Ligand binder design. Structure first.
Ligand SMILES: N[C@]12C[C@H]3C[C@H](C[C@H](C3)C1)C2
Ligand SMILES: [Cl-]
Lengths: 25, 25, 25, 25
């Protein structure tokens, strides 16, 4: 288990890489 | 719970995405 | 122990830096 | 506590933002 803020940052991180990849594809 | 280092990096990761969006718009 | 979604985001974050370094060079 | 893979990704995430700022400034 993890802190809700860490879970929130994990969702944000995944979206970050997706947008970063799409911004180049 | 999460380690303090993980909580700190979570805040930093959120900041990182916010900065990337603002810098992309 | 960490939430599985946090472990997934950790793997994705590590990949993110690898790709980021490769794309800048 | 947090998984070592999460701790590693936290260190790497912090380093990632540092490099992003330096390259931005
Ligand atoms: N990039 C991340 C660092 C830390 C571990 C994992 C989830 C959160 C917090 C964002 C990847
Ligand atoms: Cl955790």
């Amino acid at each position: 288990s993890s802190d809700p803020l860490v879970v929130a940052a994990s969702i944000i991180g995944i979206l970050h890489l997706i947008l970063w990849i799409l911004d180049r594809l």
